Write a protein that binds this DNA or RNA. Structure first.
Lengths: 85, 50, 122, 117, 133
RNA sequence: GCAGAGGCCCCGGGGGCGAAGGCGGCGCGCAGGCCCCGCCGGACCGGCCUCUGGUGCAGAUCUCGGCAGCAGUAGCCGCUACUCCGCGCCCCGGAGGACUGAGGGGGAGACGGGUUCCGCGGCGCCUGCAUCUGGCCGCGGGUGACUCGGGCCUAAGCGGCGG
RNA sequence: GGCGGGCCUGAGGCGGCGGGGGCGACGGGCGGAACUUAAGCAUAUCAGUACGCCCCGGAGGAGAAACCAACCGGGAUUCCCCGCUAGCGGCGAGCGACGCGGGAGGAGCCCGCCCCGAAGGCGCGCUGUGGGGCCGCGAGGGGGCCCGAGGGCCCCGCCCGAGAGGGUGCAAGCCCCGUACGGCGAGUAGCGCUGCUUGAGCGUGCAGCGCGAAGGGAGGCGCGGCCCUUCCAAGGCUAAAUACGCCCCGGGACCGAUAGCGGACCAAGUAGCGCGAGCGAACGGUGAAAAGGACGCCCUGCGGCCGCUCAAAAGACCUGAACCCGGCCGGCCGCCGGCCCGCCGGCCCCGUCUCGAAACACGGACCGAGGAG
RNA sequence: GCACGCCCCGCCGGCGGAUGCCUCGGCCCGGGCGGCGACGAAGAGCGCGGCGGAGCGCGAGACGCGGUGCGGACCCGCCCGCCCCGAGAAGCACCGAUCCUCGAACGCAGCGCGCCCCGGCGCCGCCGCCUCGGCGCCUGCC
């Protein structure tokens, strides 16, 4: 009754996929991502779990723009800066 | 489920497309030796989006 | 190999759009042939090449358009952001060296009054 | 750290080859009864000390002499000892003009360490 | 000793560099000593091995002279025509025995045109060194 | 005794003429232990002096990994049930006998699963017996809307609002 | 009264320009614990810490004295060395600076006021603008024996500005790559009361509210007086030395796959688990070379047997321990002692607290690895 | 009795993965760096390879495209594509573009709906500009 029979009544999705972080953590009733923090502008990052910070952080993904810019500064962005300055 | 959303239908679709074994030619090209996708899932045992 | 980019550069943009339409229709019929010939794969090394070819015509069509547009806004205040020096957000929001080294009139006079002098002590 | 600080000094010395790395600083009686007799380097020469050698605050800064206007002279003896230090330094220093003849600058010889320790 | 600190003596870094080297580095590492006559004609001790370069194997078993049919850059090995593993079946088509290029001396070089240009570049840099800088 | 460091090992320590490790047998030491021989093994390893320590296990309801005796033991006890013959499988077909018994072991939706759907082939896995079976495995397909539902309206509610 | 105009406040739209969000460090600003210690526990301690929030930058903050001192005086700031005690504290447990002195590093200035006014940064502004790294060559070794193969032996050589290192079929300065050598100043200060804070004690810094100056501040025991020494708050700027992750490079008396990161494995924050926040593995090694198994014999077939490749199956893989088990051969058996060896004699189950354990006290099936001054 | 169970005089076979040996990985310690974003970041989702699952890398120009300077034969299977004093494989360094959906995330939602000309359409500042409000301070006229 408390467990197996009541587990039989489990047929609804409390959470859904987040638009910002694509995890099954968007609460559908309250409309808040438990992990992403969406709909907030800022991301939900807490220093009590450093493991959570490590799972989604800068460098986990492609870093396509930052990698390009870093190499260019080590090549010909610094020169373009001095030309503008 | 019969009344699925489009967004949900497209995420589930990728799972069916990526539920494929390593191509035999790719094992020959990469000399993989280990021969199993592992990311493969079974509808009864898997709990996608859970 | 496929279409050489240098040969494409010599063509006008009307000539190049015609070539692009022919290459997209060719891609459509190669995709058709790959679907129709499902049991046996034929390698179809024209398919790969014409995909690249389409990209190499599109690269030449954009290069001519960007260069032409850049000269319409050359020497004009407020050019489009695509034609702006790349820099970075921090650099584009920073003081120029002249503005960093601007000195008040009384400080500037003092610097001129006392110039730096090379001196040696023994 | 020792290597990095040395490298910084060597690069600065190169940037102003004839100019010594350290500015001329005054002899100051160490503070307190415990260190009264002993003397040490201070921040800068007082304007009265630089009035005795006949200099001006700006002129002194160009010949590499540190100037402190906060420093009040206190005893007359302090003015005399520091004025003598300025006289010795002014004779020692050589000012190069004519923009920069390479030979005179090349033969200048950089001073190393506190000037007039 | 090595006076440049930037070069690494660490076995792990040096082993990794050999295993993961770029194809241009792999090709330079895959080089063989030129024969006395080739050394006199081209004025260079060794050349990177290519395909079509007759080589004499002078080291272990499978010692023979033949052209290089194939180069396995991934394995740092080359296949020499004539040098093959013993076949159980006479009918079976021969499988080549791979030979490291250090284990061979290049009797003849596929001249090409780029190879003339690359020998010339090395001969000119070698001569600046032989003039004692 | 262990693991590393600095030296030594008289022509520059011992090694594919066989290192470490493993196994059986000696010998030596009061003993920790050491040494040799044979066999397996297949590339490294020490004695001595000085130095350093994450340095020695039978226990901790010790951690982790293997695995024994129990033991071919306990069990495979719901929903009435199968039988004959035929390529003969619990497959399939025909024929008998049944059962779920229209708040069905019937035919459909909502949700939840997410390809389980269908055809062809297959049994390596799973189908707690078996399989020629299948929800399993491989391959190739499959969901068509002016009229149905979303969309749209508002409900409980929730978000928004100079502030 | 009614309309036009200026000024003053606002409203809509357009254009140019900026802002927002990210990063497990360092940095600034705030809000803020408790476990703990005090052998209890309230003050205290932890701790001006975790954590929450906000905000920059390559550093940041700080900073050119309303400073320190009491001298035969110094002289912005930051950082390092030393004093670790002056003090504070149920004066209990604890806590706690600084000035000297030695260093690294050095660098100074501006505005308001004030004078002139538009000379200006000119649609504004007289409610005051303006002036006072890449690139590149690169030395020198043969013979015999033997090995599956030398990088092994044994004779002889040679190159070292190179005997760092890596690779190559066994231990290579001379086989290869490299290495050494190159080139291109007012609602303020203060005070009264209150809260927080500090080592700061009749008050260290702060803040609320009430009240509020003029020559004012400080001098480490308050108050009133008189000196003296030293400075100028209530506005702003500033390099340097200092700190530090991601990442990149180098090194190590470091770890060696139950270790070292959770993660050495072509796909680790992966597979998997939890409604979710979050949790979170296991898994290295054939050989020199895939040469990954010739052929024949059989089998309904499955599969087996011969052998094949190889140095060797090393056959899905290096070595291959213990526990545990099957074949075959030998015995009938625990330990200690004696002897030809199955008889005689002796022998309770260890570890552990305990006065005392074989205990009907507790932990322990077994074995391997890990495991604690 | 035998078998069993023990022991082991040896000799093999199994099951396990210990022990050695290595090791493109960690872990400390120094340097260097300090380079993100409305010109759309970090992150996320779907795609993209002839044969293509994962990982990487790209983005409808997609397992890439161009330009320059290097390099000089390959391209992990099957292919086909090069091959040659240049004709140009792998590799390498910059630089120029492309860049779907979501995201600070920007017409509005989150996958459905507008308005509007043909440019598009978010918010908050700052500086100008244009339009106009007030029985704020007045003023002039008739």
């Amino acid at each position: 009754s408390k467990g197996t029979a009541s587990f039989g009544k489990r047929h609804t999705r409390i959470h859904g996929s987040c638009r910002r972080c694509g995890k099954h953590s968007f609460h559908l009733q309250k409309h808040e991502c438990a992990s992403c923090g969406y709909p907030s502008a800022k991301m939900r990052r807490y220093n009590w779990s450093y493991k959570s910070l490590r799972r989604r952080t800068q460098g986990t993904g492609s870093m396509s723009h930052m990698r390009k810019v870093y190499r260019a500064y080590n090549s010909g962005t610094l020169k373009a800066n001095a030309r503008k300055y | 489920t019969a009344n699925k959303t489009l967004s949900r239908k497209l995420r589930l679709a990728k799972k069916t497309k990526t539920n494929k074994n390593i191509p035999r030619w790719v094992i020959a090209k990469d000399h993989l030796k280990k021969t199993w996708n592992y990311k493969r899932h079974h509808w009864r045992r898997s709990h996608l989006k859970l | 190999p496929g279409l050489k980019a240098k040969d494409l550069v010599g063509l006008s943009q009307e000539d190049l759009q015609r070539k692009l339409a022919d290459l997209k229709r060719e891609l459509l019929s190669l995709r058709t042939m790959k679907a129709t010939a499902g049991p046996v794969p034929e390698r179809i090394a024209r398919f790969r090449v014409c995909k690249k070819d389409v990209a190499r015509v599109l690269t030449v069509i954009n290069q001519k358009a960007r260069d032409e547009a850049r000269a319409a806004f050359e020497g004009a205040e407020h050019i489009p952001k695509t034609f702006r020096p790349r820099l970075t957000h921090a650099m584009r929001c920073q003081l120029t060296e002249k503005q960093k080294r601007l000195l008040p009139s009384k400080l500037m006079k003092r610097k001129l009054q006392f110039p730096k002098l090379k001196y040696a002590v023994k | 750290r020792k290597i990095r600080r040395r490298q910084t000094r060597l690069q600065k010395a190169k940037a102003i080859f004839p100019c010594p790395l350290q500015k001329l600083r005054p002899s100051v009686t160490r503070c307190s009864q415990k260190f009264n007799l002993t003397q040490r380097i201070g921040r800068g020469f007082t304007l009265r000390e630089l009035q005795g050698v006949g200099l001006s605050a700006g002129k002194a800064r160009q010949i590499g002499i540190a100037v402190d206007p906060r420093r009040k002279n206190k005893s007359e003896e302090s003015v005399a000892r520091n004025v003598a230090r300025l006289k010795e330094y002014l004779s020692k220093v050589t000012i190069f003009s004519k923009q920069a003849k390479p030979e005179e600058i090349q033969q200048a010889i950089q001073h190393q360490g506190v000037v007039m320790p | 000793m090595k006076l440049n600190s930037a070069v690494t003596a660490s076995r792990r870094k040096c082993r990794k560099a050999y295993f993961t080297a770029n194809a241009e580095t792999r090709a330079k590492m895959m080089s063989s000593r030129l024969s006395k006559e080739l050394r006199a004609e081209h004025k260079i001790k060794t050349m990177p091995i290519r395909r079509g370069d007759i080589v004499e194997i002078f080291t272990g078993g499978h010692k023979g002279t033949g052209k290089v049919v194939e180069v396995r850059r991934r394995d740092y090995k080359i296949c020499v025509e004539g040098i093959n593993q013993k076949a159980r079946n006479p009918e079976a088509k021969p499988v080549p025995y791979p030979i490291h290029p250090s284990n061979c001396i290049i009797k003849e070089l596929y001249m090409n045109g780029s190879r003339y240009r690359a020998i010339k570049r090395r001969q000119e840099r070698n001569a600046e060194r032989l003039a004692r800088i």
